[PDB]
Amino acid sequence: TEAMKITLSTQPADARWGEKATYSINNDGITLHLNGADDLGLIQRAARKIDGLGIKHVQLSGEGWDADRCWAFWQGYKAPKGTRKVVWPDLDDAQRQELDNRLMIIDWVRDTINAPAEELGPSQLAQRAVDLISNVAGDRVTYRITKGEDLREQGYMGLHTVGRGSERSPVLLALDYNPTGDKEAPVYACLVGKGITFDSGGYSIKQTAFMDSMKSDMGGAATVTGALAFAITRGLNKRVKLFLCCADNLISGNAFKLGDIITYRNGKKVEVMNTDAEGRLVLADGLIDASAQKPEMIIDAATLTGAAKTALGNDYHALFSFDDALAGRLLASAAQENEPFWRLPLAEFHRSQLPSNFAELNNTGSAAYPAGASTAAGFLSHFVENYQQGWLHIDCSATYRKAPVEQWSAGATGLGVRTIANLLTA
Amino acid sequence: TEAMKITLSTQPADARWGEKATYSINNDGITLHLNGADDLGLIQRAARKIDGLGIKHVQLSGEGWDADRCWAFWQGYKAPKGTRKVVWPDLDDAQRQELDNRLMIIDWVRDTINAPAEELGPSQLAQRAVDLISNVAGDRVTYRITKGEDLREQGYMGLHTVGRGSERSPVLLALDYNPTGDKEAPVYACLVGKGITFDSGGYSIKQTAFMDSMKSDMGGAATVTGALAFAITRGLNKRVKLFLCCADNLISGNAFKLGDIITYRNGKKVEVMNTDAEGRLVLADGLIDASAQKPEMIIDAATLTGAAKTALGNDYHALFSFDDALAGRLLASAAQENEPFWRLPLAEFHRSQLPSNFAELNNTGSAAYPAGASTAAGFLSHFVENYQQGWLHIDCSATYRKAPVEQWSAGATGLGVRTIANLLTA
Amino acid sequence: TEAMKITLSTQPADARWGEKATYSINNDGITLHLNGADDLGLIQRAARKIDGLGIKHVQLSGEGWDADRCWAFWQGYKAPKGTRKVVWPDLDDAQRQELDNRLMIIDWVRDTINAPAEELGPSQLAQRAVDLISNVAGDRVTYRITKGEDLREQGYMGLHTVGRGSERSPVLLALDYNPTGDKEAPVYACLVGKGITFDSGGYSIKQTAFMDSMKSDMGGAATVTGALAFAITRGLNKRVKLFLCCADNLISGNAFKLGDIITYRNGKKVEVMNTDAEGRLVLADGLIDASAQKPEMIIDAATLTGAAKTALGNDYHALFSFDDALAGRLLASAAQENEPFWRLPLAEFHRSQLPSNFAELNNTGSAAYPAGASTAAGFLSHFVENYQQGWLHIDCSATYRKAPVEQWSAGATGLGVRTIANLLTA
Amino acid sequence: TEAMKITLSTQPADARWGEKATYSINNDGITLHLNGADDLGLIQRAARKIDGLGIKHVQLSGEGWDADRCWAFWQGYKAPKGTRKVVWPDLDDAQRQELDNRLMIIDWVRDTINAPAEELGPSQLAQRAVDLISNVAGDRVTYRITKGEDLREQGYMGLHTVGRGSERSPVLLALDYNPTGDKEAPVYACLVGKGITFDSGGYSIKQTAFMDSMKSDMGGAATVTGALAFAITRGLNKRVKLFLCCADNLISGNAFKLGDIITYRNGKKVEVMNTDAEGRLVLADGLIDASAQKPEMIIDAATLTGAAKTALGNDYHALFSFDDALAGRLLASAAQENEPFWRLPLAEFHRSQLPSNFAELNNTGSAAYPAGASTAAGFLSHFVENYQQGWLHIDCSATYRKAPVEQWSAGATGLGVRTIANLLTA
Ligand SMILES: [Ca+2]
Ligand SMILES: [Ca+2]
Ligand SMILES: [Ca+2]
Ligand SMILES: [Ca+2]
Ligand SMILES: [Cl-]
Ligand SMILES: [Cl-]
Ligand SMILES: [Cl-]
Ligand SMILES: [Cl-]
Ligand SMILES: [Cl-]
Ligand SMILES: [Zn+2]
Ligand SMILES: [Zn+2]
Ligand SMILES: [Zn+2]
Ligand SMILES: [Zn+2]
Ligand SMILES: [Zn+2]
Ligand SMILES: [Zn+2]
Ligand SMILES: [Zn+2]
Ligand SMILES: [Zn+2]
């Protein structure tokens, strides 16, 4: 499959293509027509079109290619079907290294989220996460996998109650990246991820059109895993712990039921009035562990609500926090890493918008309080001891594209890895 | 939490509150303004409002308080969340006795129905029922529990078929209150209760808005259990048998299916065309055992249909019977015990309104015969040997309040306990 | 065309048909095998079967035929398609007169309700009612037809608001049957009928499956009109007034809207929160006019709720009243006239189960009070001056069969005419 | 009635109510317990609870009462049913003036949005707006009303196409508040408001649960009208134009249809693929007129999308703009006026998220671009000549409460009036 030359030009396309065409093709190959408005976005969109032409082998030739332009092209060219090869252009040592780290880790996030639930159950997610971080951390990473009946015995009633309906046991991954080597080193940041490997909705069963992409309901877990790995390649030299709450949310003779009250280790009692709001139930157990470590920073990521996508579409990740200064610091990281985040409201009154007639907390909202992403964020705040300080919640509205768009193939995008990594090492 | 005084007055409140105000608050405490139209109702409603003010500790002070006015206040004050404390007023030995028996047994019915399915499965239901009766009956009670595969070996195909989908096995509690201890003693009455600890609807899955309260689908079993216990405290000195058909109605690779034909021990064949019409399938097995005891009367109770709630709301329990004299006696008991019952139609033609193209009986009605509670009553009559006499069926439309109302908190009300107890001891 | 003879026998069919067959056929014709259990019911079901055989011309032959048995047969034989001929047997004068009165008036009720909306608009319904009563009342009847803008101008805001959406003007028929001709004669009774000639639901549009029979939403109006004409054939010699509130509930640029507030002539303010609950809005105007006549009793009939059919199927009409003695007299009339009625609950608390946040009354109920037929009856009570005495509300759940059944063809049954006529002449 | 005294106190209530209790009662009256956290929020909630006690006559007694605490109490005490009398405390001339202007203008917005559609059609909304402004401005305001067919002849195809299905003609109100009188005086700001007096959804009909509050679909028009009047009381000394696009969105034989293409005076062609997205179609016409006045600032307000409520609940208004500095000024005005606003995303790409196969623009988004409030903002940006600068779009998600909550009765809140007025006068 002979290669197709991809060249960069600041000159416009000829009249046959128009002064508005972003790409044109002659015998020598394909020319991307840059204009300076948003060249990375234009390149990623031209790459999506090129995949559409059936061009499975390209060569980025000529001058003008840097790491971001190469990455922008690949981000758009890569698709879940067929094999693609990109002959990279000669690059600076530092840029080639940055690019290989993006291809190694951000593509692991896209591929892991795209993996079918049958291939990636809770145990595989936990192990693949250890394998990714072990490949870049070496002996600086240690971990503990707690699963099935052991979670119940230990009181992780959120993760266990949600995952016990499946024939594949729920799993808690607790990973520790300790560079200094000092076993008593202060924990700088705690990362918590929602790892629902398949979300049927449980007894609150989803419709097929809404459940057919639920193999991606572990997107949050994959995003914080990549963020820790990428942060290490960026020179992270501070202690960070990773908590993955992994489980399938299925229907069986043992699955949790509406009305069930989950008692957590911090004393919180939650009435389940919708089994499809299971992500917040498993994250609650991770936030309890992250909060006990009293780190300077707690970052959780989760494909938690459709509400976040009604508010930002798939175009931005939802940022929530009572801590304005830490939110400003994360949006600054996003600006530097070319990733999209938009802050949505989280105030004290959101902690009272999940009323229950039988327990202190309900896991689902009501008609009077329909801001689904904000009430879920208020729910999570009840599982972070100093919730007003140093805690960020990311609702992963930009993680998955059910259908191809202008700049993305179908599937996971990998967005969010770089922003969190930038914040961990800034 | 210091006690707030509650006083009764035949004088109206001042103009500030309103001439029609049922309660007012001065320096000395709260004053309930009685007019004599329906004092018990007014106090229960005032109690609900008082709970709304956040008052958690009250003392019933001054003259006028009796057992019924004390109970009316507690019936409206009690709610499933928080701790409340009532300092009773000096009462007569007989009245304090009656009140103590209502607090111990009727609140057992409210709390047991309110308990989540995870806390109260089929075995826990049967065991709590034995404990309540053993506490008031002593050595005059005996019982036999038949569960799981034993139900199928012994031909209890209705109870086994509905419950086998759950990892929590179906259970038949056969309890015998025999005061004389004589084994040949005549059985005065047989109580049969639907004990579906959780109803998902089965393959005919319910929507979340209709499933979120299904931990209460065993309200029938609790009501007859409380009725027997309360009757013993009222002097019951005749032999009474209790049959609790306990099961979870869940979805699994073992759950019953549409088109399945259940053959009962009395020869009736039933085609299942709706798995959510499971309560009548398990009750059928208890009615077969009730009939074989040749009792003077059979009383069954079940949170059986949405139709009864459409016909009577939550304001009355539905009463079905072919026996006019026995229904009259239950309505007289209802009047004396201040409980709401309303008779709905049950005639010979209802026994033919459940047509099936593959079996003698269908478990669900059709468009031509949409009287769901009457057709369910017709279905149950095929399992009572002498169905035209001594048999009462109660569709517990007043057992559970999904939301707080003027006189009740959310959850089980405990209604029906006193009426059945009065009929058993009259 | 040739007549198939129909004879009666208290002896059973031969073993080829079975000893349980209700009819058999020999060389002489068809024989109905009576057993004494319910001859009128068996005869009506047999006549439905004979219609099924395609026999269009029958002769009621031999002895044993009387008015009731001839009527029972015809009630089951008559169907909306095809033409049938029944050669009656020799009856005494009273018997034939009674039969001819049922054929003339009860089948008028069946045919009028069965008539399509295009043929029977508000104006046609009022005029046909006048034609029926003048035919038997001669010069003892006078009437007034008020329509369109005149209804709005004269304050009939309920009938006008519902009907103004149609290009066929709403119409009030006020008819006065005054035998003595004395304009000072006391009015003995007032009949109020819901005459919705077509109910689309309005902006609260109904689904096709529930709207395809809404040409029958004037069943109440036809039933009270027939009751008065039948009452006159029975010897009614007291003054009775008939009020028909006739209209189409359609969708247009002029139709009433959710949130609209209707102010009635008695001061009641009603917020419309469901345009499909339009029947009670028009009946309110008829009941104000009935109360103004200061009659000894008021009887309203209306195909008002689906709730009544969930409570009683199509097997009984729903009876609502605060007056136990009057309700008892109507159930006694119903037994004497072989018609099915069942009393559903109506208490003072139902008058407050239709809360509105913008007006005194809502026209639709809520989840906390789902007894639709009882809340609707409680709504109507706010329009009866002495609602606690002499007023009966009939929710016509037995008026229309959407599909043929054992004893009825598809369509209106005519049930209700005889009972009301009996109560008016008793 | 008799005034119930309401006193402020910085001392907690006794242990009978609790230390955390926000209000306590005695024979002297009701005492509100201020802790200093959110005195205004606490006073508003206490007032709501006082309305629940059924107190219709209150007196704010003692010191501490200023315009803001008086206003906070009134904001929670005011409800759409019954009459409330508040005996104000003595207040400084300036404090009392501010309070009287809030009562007059903000309650006007609450009462006008709460008015039923039957009472407030397009012409009544236009004339009531004129009455409010001309009442505070006098001869300093002139206006032009364009109605029905005149709108089609002058090219207002958005407003005319949406409102022509109604019997009540659409109406454009163009109001000019010109304080200097100079005809050439530059226009400082243009206000544009969605005046849909009733939204049935059109052929894309709404379900009753979502259409029962649609009398409030003109909330944006009432809010900008109230802001101008309030600005005038705050001393607005600059020229401001107000444009209200008023219409009913009904179903009739003349109503607009799916696939219809609307040509706007600015050349934009819009294909209607959802008649329920009609607010953006009428705003387009008001935004064209607003831009033609070349003002320094354009502010539009509309109850435009359910997406804004999924993003912010009813707790905040949605703010959309391409102008970061102007958006910053509205948020500062919001903080000074104690009103809740939250900024949602509006980027150049949103202008392409409403693809159509038959026109330049679609009036509705797709599954790929589900941020309905942002794509609606993108749509409106195509009708603002200088859309990147001096233009704010408010999606009024905090305008209407369908059910009563802690601090609000059911209905319009009146929120947004003060913020826009503050911005206009800053
Ligand atoms: Ca996956
Ligand atoms: Ca329970
Ligand atoms: Ca008709
Ligand atoms: Ca309005
Ligand atoms: Cl670069
Ligand atoms: Cl078990
Ligand atoms: Cl009244
Ligand atoms: Cl006032
Ligand atoms: Cl444009
Ligand atoms: Zn889920
Ligand atoms: Zn999930
Ligand atoms: Zn069921
Ligand atoms: Zn059930
Ligand atoms: Zn209707
Ligand atoms: Zn109707
Ligand atoms: Zn709309
Ligand atoms: Zn609208």
Short mmCIF file of C-alpha atoms and ligand atoms in Angstrom, two decimals, chain D residues 194 196 198-199 206 214 217-218 249 276-280 303-304, ligand 17:
data_model
loop_
_atom_site.label_atom_id
_atom_site.label_comp_id
_atom_site.label_asym_id
_atom_site.label_seq_id
_atom_site.Cartn_x
_atom_site.Cartn_y
_atom_site.Cartn_z
CA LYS D 194 -39.40 36.23 23.39
CA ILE D 196 -44.68 33.45 23.16
CA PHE D 198 -48.69 30.12 24.74
CA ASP D 199 -46.44 27.38 23.33
CA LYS D 206 -45.75 18.90 23.46
CA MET D 214 -46.39 27.22 28.67
CA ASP D 217 -43.14 31.09 27.44
CA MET D 218 -43.32 34.95 27.27
CA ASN D 249 -47.59 28.85 18.85
CA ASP D 276 -41.42 23.66 19.18
CA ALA D 277 -38.10 25.52 18.50
CA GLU D 278 -40.22 28.61 17.58
CA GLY D 279 -38.75 31.09 20.14
CA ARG D 280 -35.49 31.39 18.18
CA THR D 303 -37.49 30.95 28.03
CA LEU D 304 -35.81 29.23 25.04
ZN ZN E 17 -41.22 28.55 23.31
#
